[PDB]
Design an enzyme around this catalytic site. Structure first.
Site, PDB file in Angstrom:
ATOM      1  N   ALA A 162      -8.126   0.366   3.302  1.00  0.00           N
ATOM      2  CA  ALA A 162      -8.469   0.926   1.965  1.00  0.00           C
ATOM      3  C   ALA A 162      -9.977   1.693   2.313  1.00  0.00           C
ATOM      4  CB  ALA A 162      -8.825  -0.384   1.077  1.00  0.00           C
ATOM      5  N   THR A 175       0.805  -1.282   0.133  1.00  0.00           N
ATOM      6  CA  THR A 175       0.021  -0.003   0.154  1.00  0.00           C
ATOM      7  C   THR A 175       0.927   1.229   0.028  1.00  0.00           C
ATOM      8  OG1 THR A 175      -1.834  -1.207   1.015  1.00  0.00           O
ATOM      9  CG2 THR A 175      -1.736   1.371   1.019  1.00  0.00           C
TER      10      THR A 175
END
EC number: 3.4.25.1
Lengths: 198, 195, 192, 237, 209, 176, 215, 214, 189, 214
Positions: free
Chosen positions: C49, C1
């Site tokens: 997320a 990420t």
């Protein structure tokens, strides 16, 4: 921490010991425990002294307000019923327990009141750390039909049983008679190098 | 002025006395006698507690609110104390909440005289929409209340009350017209006499 | 990420890898981390997320209510600050992210952690792979940097991060916030 | 229901609130009072409401600040209570005694709220503040019975405030007073305001606020001293 | 005098009476306590399965009291189990009716309604509730427009030993004499087993006949 | 943290004393930290509670002291803090207050503590002072017994010491 | 609160009278584009000629002219912006003018304390193309073609009645407002005596610069 | 109870009464001097026994000062709260918007009355901005404005005439039209980044004496 | 790490310019300066937003006071104010973990700096330090410091303390934002 | 309601409170004297119908260990006022643990009676009441009235014909007098205008015992 009461013929001899310990150290060798809820009714306390003192002050202001209002000295059962509720509502946050004794025209009543709120009148009750040792002596020795003065000879020895045998409880016995005949407080009742200046 | 509870320039609540006049216009004529051993009441009989009763006198609807409040407090007494509320204490408390009607301009006096009877010896309390209560010895409240009070002042207990209603309303009754409630020393249980 | 960002005299570049994961399964490799708020300032997504989308939707909303009412642009300082305040309230709730506010103002790059760590540096990489991304980053980074050299630097530093981080795979997604504002400078692949 | 409500927050077509005007007039019924600043201390004379024989206004807001209450008594107590609370809350968290100017603004915020909203009657009571805030030294403030406050060098409030304060306009010279001159002018104006030529000890009482040896102290005058000032008055006549 | 809290000097609140007038306008309901059951008729609400209601006075307000009575019956069934007795139900709903009279802001009710219930212990009970919150038991009730005018014919009836079976026709008959008339009738008596229910359509058509 | 609170009553003079230190963990912070706040009071236990109770008490006490210029009785002050701390019996502040000082105008000492002499604090003291206490001491003596008890209990104790303050309350003088 | 004996409420009809002391405003709808227009409403000369404002943005696609009580308008306007962004946040589509106007109508007469005096003219070009919803202070929105709101507006209404055109061109529709605003106004209209704002089918809403207005 | 219910006129009662209440206030002149802002007030009514919301924003209310401080306190809480939320300080316009929203609120409320002040909110951005705010909640930018008793005649005095020179305008309006007062007048120029700064009366004599020469 | 010294006519305070989550520092420009007035200066070590979410919350009050009263608070006054807040938060849902030094210079009460525990244990400090490098440094400053000193000497006394944080301590805190407070008011060094 | 029924008259008089003072003018006479052994309070009450009771509702109700009240005015209002007075006294005892100083209970109760002269929807208390107390070395004799104004007295009177009752109290009595001797002036001032009586001394508050009232 041996507090006790007995219902003798004319009323209730409450009895108490003058000690309060913060664990293993005696912080007060002259501790007052037979708190005056009212001139008629008195309540010994045991468990945490803070809870007992403060809860007794709350019921004192309460009882003295109700009697102040009717102008008639309050009943014992009343004192007990608000104590039953008061020690129930917290559900064990008030972990200090009370031995209430009083006389109303209805005559003597002496309820041990456990801190979860059980009120049980009985001829003899004991509480505190010393209670087991004390109650065996109250069981063995208490007799119904006991007179007024022999109770003094029945709670001073019973509390004494808690003074010697126990290590939470000690010091001078307090003994407080409850009768419509007379009330008695006997505050200290029964007794069983220089750091050179300059 | 004479509409919101406030003092007149004479220091007099108008709405309160209007409530007394509403009690008189309730058209009923209650009387109670305190014997030594018994406490007759006669007229609307109520049983506020199994040991306590009272007769409201005035507006009919208004009676029921204070009946229920009396039962609320009477029951709540035993709940916090654990013995019958004395007749004095009950009348005191209901009077204390009837004053709330008077202190507040929002809500209005309930016009019902409240003659309590019950043994704490026997008690005959009065209560007014004023919030004033006092123990009488032989009360009466209603229409011919003043005409009865003379006959009470002149003064077997049941007879006192029944002859008082008979002489004072100047009518011979039928038994259904005179509802009668007695609370004898031996019978602290509120009970309608049933002459 | 991984979501690097750095500013230099001809822009602020914000590159991001496109992998997203749950467990050791990889649900998708399509996400564009740099959630939009404003033509000329932009977000980031690091950490969970959903958090970044939601918070930056609230951010985009609040920046829009502000730009209408105040009748001026919201600044990178102000944007990061409202953001930092809003993520603080949910401190201890585990709403963890590493959003960054970027945009030309001079250029403004403010890293904004979820625990409220609104810090202004110039050079950042945020996320799991950041520790990889950092080491490459410093080595080419200079304020004296061309728009192209900077494009290569952002791409090398993302490429070296994704190479080691198991949870970061997917294509590099440059946005360049130059004087005028951002453009999708590259979306180009890592599997080249 | 609300048909009764007379509003008492309304704004009038003459452009001046009703209760505020009425509050000003309530004070005229209130008895005379005056405070007089000096460069070393601040006086507060006040007249005990009647001399009545068988009865056996200034208060301690702090030990460094004090108030005179003029317009009415029943409301005044609530004002004084709130003043003591504000001052001692400020002393609680900031751990310094409240500066007096602030204490006045706080109570005047509380007063103003009664005019502005809620349909409740405003406090009708003009106050004075004698005090010695740290940052300005001695100071005196007057609180109109609607929010206002005015730092005043000498002022009077109560019955004949106008004649008394106007008398002090020319009779209070600026920036010259030793406390001795404050006592002289105080006793003058309170003397002139009553129809009694001189005033009795059951009429005046004077709380002098004096910086007592580095610890400021408020003291109501001891009556024997009240009577030396009055006894001086008899010869000032 | 026009506001409810105020008393007129003489001894009443005129607002309550103005609210009372509303039912003096609307057409007659007539319930009849009977050797078993209360045949409500109104030229009906299932307050409970146990209890029937026949409203009079403006209908708008009447439904709210019906719904409160349904609520009251349900809270009683839950807290106590057993199906509510009417002697208590009347008093509860009547108490709620009474509260309005006492405060300026809410207006007194327009309605007056006879709830009734057959039950085993009580037998038939026919209580009418005034908008003052004065509820009484009855042997017959008839309220509305033809208020004493119906009362003379229910006085002519002597139900005390009339069966419910005569009365289901008689209510409609009294309705016809005091009264075109839309007819409604209800049976709550032990044949209906305390199930509040409208008269069976053939007998209802016969009753109008 | 904590700190010790000596307190002792011999003759009208009312002794009280305390260590002037507090520690962040086991490291001393300050060699000067007030515990005896002026009828005096000496709180020890947590520093946060020492300061919180001192502030809250002076507040409640000043509202009274303005409301009557009548000085507070020691017994009423004991009730004041007693009630003040029992309000948190669900969240109780940890500090042990031991007031010491005269009953007004009768020159009569009243010492007491709250959950002869009353010692409280992190401490060492209760066993040390008890047989040394003389029921009569001039302040000259009183200073000596309390200073010995203070220094001996606290020099031994790990987390207290490093400065001593001694107020021996008397109308005539208050020595430090 | 009191329904008059003649049906309709009092405060509302008094609020309608409050509009008459509000600025004239044409709300042109060309089927190309939107052309909200309003007299500057400036009277005082040292009062700023470019800081006074009458027409505000709501979204990038909805403009909002106002009339009546200018201060009151800004509450309903700000709440309209909050509603539209809330719609964007929940559904990612922009809120159409019919519902943007509806949400503001819902708040219009919620006094259980007093009704707003504002007339509003939302103009927003939404997927349907041009839409122009007038909003009465009676809590009634209505779709329009040409409605002019405010004080000399009744004459602007009737003037519009002859000149309203089937379809319409964007620039020609603008010229209609530029001519009618000279009639409704007492003074000779100047670009500092109007604040025009227009939305072409493709553009985002634009406050019109003054130089363009002289032509 | 709704207080400011609409009249049958279409006016609002409390609001128009409040408009006449600021007219009783003193002549709070202001002008947005091209260099710097300057503002001032008059009629202190000296018996001789006798704002700034930010380092940019400042205020010169007219009306009844009893209300005016009470407005400004809430305005000051709003300034500082904004400085913590956006990094930069509040702009003069945002202040004017809030104060105007705040004043509006009390008309549409239960039991409240409009604040009787009409504030001349003033402040640097570094370009001067000189707003009026009126009880209604209307706020308008101005370049000159004066609200107060006889201030209207002063605005007209400005209209026909519109550091030393902006101060000359602020003095001239008062020392020609309003009563001549060398102490009643309290003008305060605010320099660009120096906080609104009053002068000693002798420093005001730059024009208070030079107008005597003019 | 934070350090504070009280001098004859000054208060000297200085701060490491760093913060790190994870293994790396993410800035070295991080200002643990929280200047709040001309002569009232917080310095807040502590983790996360709480250090600045608190610092500014104090700042805006301390500033709000100055507009609302027209004068500036004492270092003591500001100190007891922040002390109050921290005590309230300890019993609260959110107990802030901020260890701060409130430097300040009153004119007529003179220069003062105060140590403040996160729990809230205000104490006037002749010299003080915070952080975890406080365990190391406080001994140097306790040995070396005397009653006299000078601002010229204060620089050397502080430069010597800087050595401990590199030479014996594990973490690298490389630049120190030295600043002074003197009758003149605050200056960077 | 939420709106107070107390509002100023055009010159600033609280009309409803003045009318409350008229309600005090009614009610049976009260009297109270501070003698020097202890205060006495006494009041007329009447048989009226001859069917009454005299121990039912004393106007003389003890409040606290050594305080008492006697009212003039409306009797209904007294019953609740006493309740709050007892509330303040018992509440004070659990917090402070000494029976509350006479002056303080009078003050706190005065504040209760002041609240309704500012509080919505309520009228002021009609009852005025002597509040007689003895602490420490002093007998205290207080008068609280409808506005919540209170005064300590050496001798005072209330109810019907207080106007003459106070006159007798200043000439028939002064200084000090042994407690029954200062009851002499009570029984003979009350005579100017059944009866309840209660005394204070230092013997616990007390109702003058009925055989000895005779």
């Amino acid at each position: 921490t041996t507090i006790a009461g007995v219902v003798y013929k004319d009323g209730i001899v409450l009895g108490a010991d003058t000690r309060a310990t913060e664990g293993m150290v005696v912080a007060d060798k002259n501790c007052s425990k037979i708190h005056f809820i009212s001139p008629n009714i008195y309540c010994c306390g045991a468990g945490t002294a803070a809870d007992t003192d403060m809860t007794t002050q709350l019921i004192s202001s309460n009882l003295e307000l109700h009697s102040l209002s009717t102008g008639r000295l309050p009943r014992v059962v009343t004192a007990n019923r608000m104590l039953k509720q008061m020690l129930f509502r917290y559900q064990g946050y008030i972990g200090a327990a009370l031995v209430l004794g009083g006389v109303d025209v209805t005559g003597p009543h002496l309820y041990s009141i456990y801190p979860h709120g059980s009120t049980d009148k009985l001829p003899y009750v004991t509480m505190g750390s010393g209670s087991l040792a004390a109650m065996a002596v109250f069981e063995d020795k208490f007799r119904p039909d006991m007179e007024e003065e022999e109770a003094k000879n029945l709670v001073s020895e019973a509390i004494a049983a808690g003074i010697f045998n126990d290590l939470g409880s000690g010091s001078n016995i307090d003994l407080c008679v409850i009768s419509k005949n007379k009330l008695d407080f006997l505050r200290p009742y029964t007794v069983p190098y220089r750091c050179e200046k300059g | 002025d004479r509409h919101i509870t406030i003092f007149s320039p004479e220091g007099r609540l108008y709405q309160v006395e209007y409530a007394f006049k509403a009690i008189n216009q309730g058209g009923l004529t209650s009387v109670a006698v305190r014997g030594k051993d018994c406490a007759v009441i006669v007229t609307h009989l109520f049983k506020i507690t199994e040991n306590i009763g009272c007769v409201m006198t005035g507006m009919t609807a208004d009676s029921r609110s204070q009946v229920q409040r009396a039962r609320y407090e009477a029951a709540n007494w035993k709940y916090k104390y654990g013995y019958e509320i004395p007749v004095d204490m009950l009348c005191k408390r209901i009077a204390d909440i009837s004053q709330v009607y008077t202190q507040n301009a929002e809500m209005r006096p309930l016009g019902c005289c409240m003659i309590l009877i019950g043994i704490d010896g026997p008690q005959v309390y009065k209560c007014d929409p004023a919030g004033y209560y006092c123990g009488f010895k032989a009360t009466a409240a209603g229409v011919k209340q003043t005409e009865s009070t003379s006959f009470l002042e002149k003064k077997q207990t049941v007879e006192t009350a029944i002859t008082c209603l008979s002489t004072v309303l100047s009518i011979d009754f039928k038994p259904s017209e005179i509802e009668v409630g007695v609370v004898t020393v031996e019978n602290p249980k509120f009970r309608i006499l049933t002459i | 990420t991984t979501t690097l960002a750095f500013k230099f005299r001809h822009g602020v570049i914000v590159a991001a890898d496109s992998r997203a994961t749950a467990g050791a399964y990889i649900a998708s490799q399509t996400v564009k981390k740099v959630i939009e708020i404003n033509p000329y300032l932009l977000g980031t997504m690091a950490g969970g997320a959903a958090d970044c989308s939601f918070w930056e939707r609230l951010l985009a909303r609040q920046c829009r209510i502000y730009e209408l009412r105040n009748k001026e642009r919201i600044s990178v300082a102000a944007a990061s600050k409202l953001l930092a305040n809003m993520v603080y309230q949910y401190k201890g709730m585990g709403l963890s992210m590493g959003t960054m506010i970027c945009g030309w103002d001079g250029p403004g790059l403010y890293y904004v952690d979820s625990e409220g760590n609104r810090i202004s540096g110039a050079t950042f990489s945020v996320g799991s792979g950041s520790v990889y991304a950092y080491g490459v980053m410093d080595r080419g980074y200079s304020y004296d940097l061309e728009v192209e050299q900077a494009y290569d630097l952002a791409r090398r530093a993302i490429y070296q991060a994704t190479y080691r981080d198991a949870y970061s795979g997917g294509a590099v997604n440059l946005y360049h916030v130059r004087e005028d504002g951002w453009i999708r400078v590259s979306s180009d692949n890592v599997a080249d | 229901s609300r048909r009764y409500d007379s509003r008492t927050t309304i704004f009038s077509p003459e452009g001046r609130l009703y209760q505020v005007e009425y509050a000003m007039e309530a004070i005229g019924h209130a008895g005379t009072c005056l405070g007089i600043l000096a460069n070393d201390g601040v006086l507060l004379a006040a007249e005990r409401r009647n001399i009545h024989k068988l009865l056996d206004k200034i208060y301690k807001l702090n030990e460094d600040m004090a108030c005179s209450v003029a317009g009415i008594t029943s409301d005044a107590n609530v004002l004084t209570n709130e003043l003591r609370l504000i001052a001692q809350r400020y002393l609680l968290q900031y751990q310094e005694p409240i500066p007096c100017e602030q204490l006045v603004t706080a109570l005047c915020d509380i007063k103003q709220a009664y005019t502005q909203f809620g349909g409740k009657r405003p406090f009708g009571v003009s106050l004075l503040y004698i005090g010695w805030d740290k940052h300005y030294g001695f100071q005196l403030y007057q609180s109109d019975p609607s929010g206002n406050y005015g730092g005043w060098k000498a002022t009077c409030i109560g019955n004949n405030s106008a004649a008394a304060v106007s008398m002090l306009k020319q009779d209070y010279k600026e920036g010259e007073m030793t406390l001795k001159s404050a006592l002289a002018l105080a006793i003058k104006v309170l003397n002139k305001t009553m129809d009694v030529s001189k005033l009795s000890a059951e009429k005046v009482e004077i709380a002098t606020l004096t910086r007592e040896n580095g610890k400021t102290v408020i003291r109501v005058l001891k009556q024997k001293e009240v009577e030396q000032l009055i006894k001086k008055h008899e010869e000032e006549e | 005098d026009l506001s409810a809290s105020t008393f007129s000097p003489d001894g009443r609140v005129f607002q309550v009476e103005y609210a009372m007038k509303a039912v003096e306008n609307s057409s007659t309901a007539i319930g009849i306590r009977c050797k078993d059951g209360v045949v409500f008729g109104v030229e009906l609400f299932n307050v409970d399965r146990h209890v029937g209601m026949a409203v009079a006075g403006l209908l708008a307000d009447a439904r709210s009291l019906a719904d409160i009575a349904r609520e009251e019956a349900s809270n009683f069934r839950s807290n106590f189990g057993y199906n509510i007795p009417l002697k208590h139900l009347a008093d509860r709903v009547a108490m709620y009716v009474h509260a309005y009279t006492l405060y300026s802001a809410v207006r007194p009710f327009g309605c007056s309604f006879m709830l009734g219930s057959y039950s085993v212990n009580d037998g038939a009970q026919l209580y009418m509730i005034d908008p003052s919150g004065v509820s009484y038991g009855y042997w017959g009730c008839a309220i509305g427009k033809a208020r004493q005018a119906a009362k003379t014919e229910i006085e002519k009836l002597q139900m005390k030993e009339m069966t419910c079976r005569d009365i289901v026709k008689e209510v409609a008959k009294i309705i016809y004499i005091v009264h075109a008339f839309e007819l409604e009738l209800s049976w709550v008596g032990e044949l209906t087993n305390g199930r509040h229910e409208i008269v069976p359509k053939d007998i209802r058509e016969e009753a109008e006949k | 943290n904590g700190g010790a609170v000596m307190a002792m009553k011999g003759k009208n003079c009312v002794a009280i004393a305390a260590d002037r230190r507090f520690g962040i963990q086991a490291q001393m912070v300050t060699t000067d930290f007030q515990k005896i706040f002026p009828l005096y009071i000496g709180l020890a236990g947590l520093a946060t509670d020492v300061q919180t109770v001192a502030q809250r008490l002076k507040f409640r006490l000043n509202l009274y002291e303005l409301k009557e210029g009548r000085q507070i009785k020691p017994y009423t002050l004991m009730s004041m803090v007693a009630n003040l701390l029992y309000e948190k019996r669900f969240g109780p502040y940890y500090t042990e207050p031991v007031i010491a000082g005269l009953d007004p105008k009768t020159f009569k000492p009243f010492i007491c503590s709250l959950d002869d002499f009353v010692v409280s604090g992190t401490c060492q003291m209760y066993g040390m002072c008890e047989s040394l206490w003389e029921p009569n001491m001039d302040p000259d003596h009183l200073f000596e017994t309390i200073s010995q008890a203070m220094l001996n209990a606290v020099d031994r104790d790990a987390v207290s010491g490093m400065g001593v303050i001694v107020h021996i309350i008397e109308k005539d003088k208050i020595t430090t | 609160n009191t329904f008059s004996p003649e049906g309709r409420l009092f405060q509302v009809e008094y609020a309608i009278e409050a509009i008459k002391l509000g600025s004239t405003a044409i709300g042109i709808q060309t089927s190309e584009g939107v052309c909200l227009a309003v007299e500057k409403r400036i009277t005082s000369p040292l009062m700023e000629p470019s800081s006074i404002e009458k027409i505000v943005e709501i979204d990038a696609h909805i403009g909002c002219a106002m009339s009546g009580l200018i201060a009151d308008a800004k509450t309903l306007i700000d709440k309209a912006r909050v509603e539209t962004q809330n719609h964007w946040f929940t559904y990612n589509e922009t809120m159409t003018v019919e519902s943007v106007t509806q949400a503001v109508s819902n708040l219009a007469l919620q006094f259980g304390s007093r009704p707003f005096g504002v007339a509003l003219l939302f103009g927003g070009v939404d997927e349907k193309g041009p839409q122009l919803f007038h909003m009465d202070p009676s809590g009634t929105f209505v779709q329009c073609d040409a409605r002019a709101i405010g004080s000399a507006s009744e004459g602007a209404q009737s003037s519009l009645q002859e000149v309203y055109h089937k379809s319409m061109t964007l620039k020609e529709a603008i010229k209609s407002s530029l001519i009618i605003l000279k009639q409704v106004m007492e003074e000779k209209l100047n670009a500092t005596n109007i604040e025009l704002a227009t939305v072409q089918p493709g553009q985002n809403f634009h406050m019109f610069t003054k130089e363009e207005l002289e032509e | 109870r709704a207080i400011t219910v609409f009249s049958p006129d279409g006016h609002l009662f409390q609001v128009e009464y409040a408009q006449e209440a600021v007219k009783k206030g003193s002549t709070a002149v202001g002008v947005r001097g091209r260099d710097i802002v300057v503002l001032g007030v008059e009629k202190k009514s000296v018996a001789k026994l006798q704002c700034a919301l930010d380092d940019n924003v400042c205020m010169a209310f007219a009306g009844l000062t009893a209300d005016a401080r009470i407005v400004i306190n809430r305005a000051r809480v709003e300034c500082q709260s904004h400085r913590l939320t956006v990094e930069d300080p509040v702009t003069v316009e945002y202040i004017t918007r809030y104060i105007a929203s705040l004043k509006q609120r009390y008309t549409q409320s239960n039991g409240r009355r409009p604040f009787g002040i009409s504030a001349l909110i003033v402040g640097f951005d570094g370009t001067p901005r000189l707003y009026q705010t009126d009880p209604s909640g209307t706020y308008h930018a101005w370049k000159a404005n004066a609200i107060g008793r006889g201030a209207k005649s002063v605005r007209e005095f400005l209209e026909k005439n519109y550091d030393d020179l902006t101060i000359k305008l602020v003095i001239k309006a008062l020392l020609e039209v309003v009563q001549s007062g060398g102490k009643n007048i309290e003008l305060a120029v605010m320099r660009r980044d120096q906080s609104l700064k009053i002068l000693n009366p002798e420093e005001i004599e730059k024009y208070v004496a030079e107008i005597e020469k003019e | 790490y934070l350090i504070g010294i009280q001098g004859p006519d000054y208060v000297l305070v200085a701060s490491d310019r760093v913060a790190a989550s994870n293994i790396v520092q993410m800035k070295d420009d991080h200002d643990k300066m929280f200047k709040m007035s001309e002569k009232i200066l917080l310095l807040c070590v502590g983790e996360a937003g709480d250090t600045v979410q608190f610092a500014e919350y104090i700042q805006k009050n301390v500033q709000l006071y100055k507009m609302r009263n027209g004068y500036e608070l004492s270092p003591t006054a500001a100190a007891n104010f922040t002390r109050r807040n921290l005590a309230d938060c300890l019993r609260s849902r959110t107990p802030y973990h901020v260890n701060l030094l409130l430097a300040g210079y009153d004119e007529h009460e003179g220069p003062a700096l105060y140590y403040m525990d996160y729990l809230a244990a205000l104490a006037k400090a002749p010299f003080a330090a915070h952080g975890y490098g406080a365990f190391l440094t406080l001994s140097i400053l306790d040995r070396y410091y005397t009653p006299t000193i000078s601002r010229e000497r204060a620089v050397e006394l502080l430069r010597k303390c800087l050595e401990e944080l590199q030479k014996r301590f594990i973490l690298n805190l490389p630049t120190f934002s030295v600043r002074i407070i003197d009758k003149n008011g605050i200056h960077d060094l | 309601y939420s709106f107070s029924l107390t509002t100023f008259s055009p010159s600033g008089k609280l009309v409803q409170i003045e009318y409350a003072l008229a309600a005090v003018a009614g009610g049976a006479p009260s009297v109270g004297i501070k003698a020097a052994n202890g205060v006495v309070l006494a009041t007329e009450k009447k048989q009226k119908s001859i069917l009454y009771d005299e121990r039912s509702v004393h106007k003389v109700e003890p409040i606290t260990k050594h305080i008492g009240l006697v009212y003039s005015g409306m009797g209904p209002d007294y019953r609740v006022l006493v309740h709050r007075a007892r509330k303040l006294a018992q509440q004070y005892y659990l917090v402070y643990q000494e029976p509350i100083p006479t002056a303080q209970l009078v003050q706190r109760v005065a504040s209760v009676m002041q609240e309704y002269t500012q509080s919505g929807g309520v009228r002021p208390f009609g009852v005025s009441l002597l509040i007689c107390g003895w602490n420490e070395g002093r007998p205290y004799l207080f008068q609280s009235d409808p506005s919540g104004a209170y005064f300590a007295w050496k001798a005072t009177a209330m109810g019907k014909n207080y106007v003459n009752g106070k006159t007798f109290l200043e000439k028939r009595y002064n200084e000090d007098l042994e407690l029954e001797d200062a009851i002499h002036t009570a029984i003979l001032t009350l005579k100017e205008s059944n009866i309840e009586v209660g005394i204070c001394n230092e013997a616990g508050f007390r109702r003058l015992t009925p055989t000895e009232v005779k």
